[PDB]
Design a binder for these strands. Structure first.
Lengths: 146, 260, 218
RNA sequence: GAAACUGCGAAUGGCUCAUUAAAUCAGUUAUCGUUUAUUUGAUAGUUCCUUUACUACAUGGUAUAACUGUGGUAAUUCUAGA
RNA sequence: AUUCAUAAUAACUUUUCGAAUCGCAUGGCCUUGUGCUGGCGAUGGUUCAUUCAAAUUUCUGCCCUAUCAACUUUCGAUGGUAGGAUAGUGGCCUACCAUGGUUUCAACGGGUAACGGGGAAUAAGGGUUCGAUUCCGGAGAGGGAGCCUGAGAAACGGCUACCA
């Protein structure tokens, strides 16, 4: 569950059209923009005080949350900024009248204002597809048993 | 498949046009226009299935080309014109004024009105938005955009708009306890009140409808359409008054009225 | 081969069929656009400085400009370039073509006189044909007759005479771009509609501002 | 009222079912992730010039078809020269 | 839910749009110049809206097959940064940087006499087989790719290339 420095790659990670004016004495140490996610969900305090960028985040970021809202547990965490959900559910069969246990996987974009690991029932909404698998951004988290 | 359909066969048009299955393959396929092709009705099926003033498309074309049919006041020679909701199709020849309002069953029927009330159509607004030079504007559901509104208007408010002025007259602010005309689904064409209103923020908010005769139902909100004050609707209403009798008492009314 | 010769200044054109190989071979190693004198093919052509224009091969496959390396060849053609009128607009087509440099099997060459010599040719020196359809734009008529700005070009147009079986009558071109009281009323109406719609939106904005002041009065 | 120039449409219809097995497709979603002729409805007061010796607005230019005539090739909804 | 609509500033732009158009009527004026106004409706012309649409896209759902138990990565396989491309998101592609992603809850590979769905047949109920076919959606114009025109086509009653 690792993090990084301020700037790492060959660009300078900032947000678009946010201009920390060097001439005026910035009493505050940044101009950190964010938004409210809606659907009753709360921006974490870590997001506002934080120092990541992640343009794909619903918080301090440029994508938006709409479409389906879902939950699920976390089975993989070994990517960079993405986890892998397992929406466990039951499938009916008409003929046998009996359920059958089934699952999918739906990898979502873990933002670095959210500390997740294996366990961690999360809640996560749809956010204008990010890469080939990931269409979902995590918005709320919770632990597993303790 | 490379571009826009211009044909549309029978067994694919809406059912509120009530077209017979036979005497063609095709169904008169609205042009682009003010009203959607699920919620509108072309002038040709209006004139030849619902008013019987012609028997042939040859005939309907000549009828429209004689410049009498002033659908919302303007002469229309286009057979494929999508006449839709709250439309004020008037004449000069028979001096009649038809307003496209529904049935209790969900069918654009005939509603013959006077010259008074043939001079205003209603409209639900569906987005109100700000444009060039700081000018606000308001949409309707025929696509009549209107600049310089009353700022008291919000979304889902209805407006009485005349024919030719535009010039937004008496609107109705939307809230609880108002007469509306539900125009979709199975609640299409029934009239009730705004007994309760609910917001499911994010998807498809709803409104409880109580009619006069104690029948609660609960509709979606793109099917709502305010027709006005409590017992005071701004236009006239058909037979049934949008009440949707049960089928057994419907048969009972038909049988009792059958004969003297 | 067969040689068409054209003189535009009198507006005429005529085919000859010279066969003397010693005369014909002087036109080889020559592309389209060059100038010659035809003293080899005829002493009657002496002094007549020509300019080669084009022609067809022994199969009718024509030539063009900048179509060098002269054996018969295929080429993808487009609009606005010759040897192909597009049968469906937008379409291009691959038509065959022949090179402009004169070789032996150029079955028809055609050329123009650009400088008249001294001798006489019976059908292209004294026989003159005027133009068929006269000027029809007003400024074309003004430049054709050398007319001034207000010389009333209405009644100075080319009138053509026809009889039906006996009934003689004149006819004239319908002059387009004439300044008419029609266009006067049209420009008047269009400008007036523009300024009036502008003033109407201004006054509507003013009335709306009064209404917003009344709303803000609370 | 032929021929053409123009603008439109020939992307619709029609046919078959070879492929394609989480692909299509059916329900159910989104465009806060974008284009859209058309029809409908709105909409447009400013274009050049150290703002005096201005520079068409009662209005500016040639450049091509159909046509005329000379032709090709056995031959195309072929075309060239003028 | 917004960096949303919008508004303003500083400029930039092979400076896009701002009717050199047409048909009926022929009307009102005085300072008669043959001057000044003047309607009805036809195409266009910029953005926005509506409509007809289209493309992506969330979820969930497919017949047989283990005599198919591991698959994916040169050449993108999963994910990030940033750029190009695009109508626009997007590994769609490129550089760089991590080894990820899937799977005995059946992945990947094979079959099919596989277009799918609306439905059809047979029907006690539970079902089983079929659906090339009168409608929607798809896909293709001999096989395969490329591209002009155009709002819209990888158009074939269009073109070009090869192969048959």
């Amino acid at each position: 569950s690792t993090e990084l420095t301020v700037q790492s790659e060959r660009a300078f990670q900032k947000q678009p059209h946010i201009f920390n004016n060097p001439k005026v004495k910035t009493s505050k140490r940044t101009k950190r923009w964010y938004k409210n996610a809606g659907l009753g969900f709360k921006t974490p305090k870590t997001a506002i005080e934080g120092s990541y960028i992640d343009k794909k985040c619903p918080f301090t970021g440029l994508v938006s949350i709409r479409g389906k809202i879902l939950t699920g547990t976390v089975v993989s965490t070994k990517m960079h900024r993405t986890i892998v959900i397992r929406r466990a559910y039951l499938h009916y069969i008409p003929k046998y009248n009996r359920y059958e246990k089934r699952h999918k996987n739906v990898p979502v974009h873990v933002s670095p204002a959210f500390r997740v690991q294996v366990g961690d029932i999360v809640t996560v909404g749809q956010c204008r597809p990010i890469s080939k698998t990931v269409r979902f951004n995590v918005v709320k988290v919770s632990a597993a048993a303790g | 498949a490379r571009g826009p359909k211009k044909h549309l066969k029978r067994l694919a048009a809406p059912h509120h046009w009530l077209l017979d299955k036979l005497s063609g393959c095709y169904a008169p396929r609205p042009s682009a226009g003010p009203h959607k092709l699920r919620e509108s009705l072309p002038l040709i099926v209006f004139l030849r299935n619902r008013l019987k003033y012609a028997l042939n498309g040859r005939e309907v074309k000549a009828i429209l080309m004689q410049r009498h049919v002033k659908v919302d006041g303007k002469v229309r020679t286009d057979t494929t014109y999508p006449a839709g909701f709250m439309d004020v199709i008037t004449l000069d020849a028979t001096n009649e004024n038809f307003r496209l309002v529904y049935d209790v069953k969900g069918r654009f029927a005939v509603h013959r009105i006077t010259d008074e009330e043939a001079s205003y159509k209603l409209g639900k607004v569906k987005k109100v938005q700000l444009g060039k030079k700081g000018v606000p504007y308001v949409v309707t559901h025929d696509g009549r955009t209107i600049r310089y509104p009353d700022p008291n208007i919000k979304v889902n408010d209805t407006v009485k708009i005349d024919l030719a002025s535009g010039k937004i007259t008496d609107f109705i602010k939307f809230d609880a306890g108002k007469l509306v005309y539900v125009t979709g689904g199975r609640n299409l064409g029934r009239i009730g009140t705004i007994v309760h209103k609910e917001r499911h923020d994010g998807g498809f908010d709803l409104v409880h409808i109580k009619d006069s005769l104690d029948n609660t139902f609960v509709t979606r909100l793109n099917n709502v359409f305010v027709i006005g004050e409590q017992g005071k609707p701004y236009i006239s209403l058909p037979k049934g008054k949008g009440i949707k009798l049960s089928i057994a008492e419907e048969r009972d009314r038909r049988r009792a009225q059958q004969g003297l | 081969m067969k040689l068409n010769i054209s003189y535009p200044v009198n507006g005429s054109q005529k085919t000859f069929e010279i066969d003397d190989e010693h005369r014909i071979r002087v036109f080889f190693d020559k592309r389209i656009g060059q100038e010659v004198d035809g003293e080899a093919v005829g002493d009657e052509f002496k002094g007549y400085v020509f300019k080669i224009s084009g022609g067809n091969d022994k199969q009718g496959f024509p030539m063009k400009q900048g179509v060098l390396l002269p054996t018969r060849i295929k080429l993808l053609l487009t609009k606005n370039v010759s040897c192909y009128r597009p049968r469906r607009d937008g379409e291009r087509k691959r038509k065959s073509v022949r090179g402009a440099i004169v070789g032996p099997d150029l079955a028809v060459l055609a050329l123009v006189i650009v400088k008249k010599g001294e001798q006489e040719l019976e059908g292209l020196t004294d026989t003159t044909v005027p133009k068929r359809l006269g000027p029809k734009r007003a400024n074309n008529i003004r430049k054709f007759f050398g007319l001034s700005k207000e010389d009333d070009v209405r009644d100075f147009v080319i009138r053509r005479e026809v009889t039906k079986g006996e009934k003689t009558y004149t006819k004239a071109p319908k002059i387009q771009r004439l300044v008419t009281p029609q266009r006067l009323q049209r420009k008047r109406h269009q400008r007036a509609l523009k300024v009036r719609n502008a003033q109407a939106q201004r006054e509507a904005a003013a009335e709306y501002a009064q209404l917003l002041a009344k709303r803000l009065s609370e």
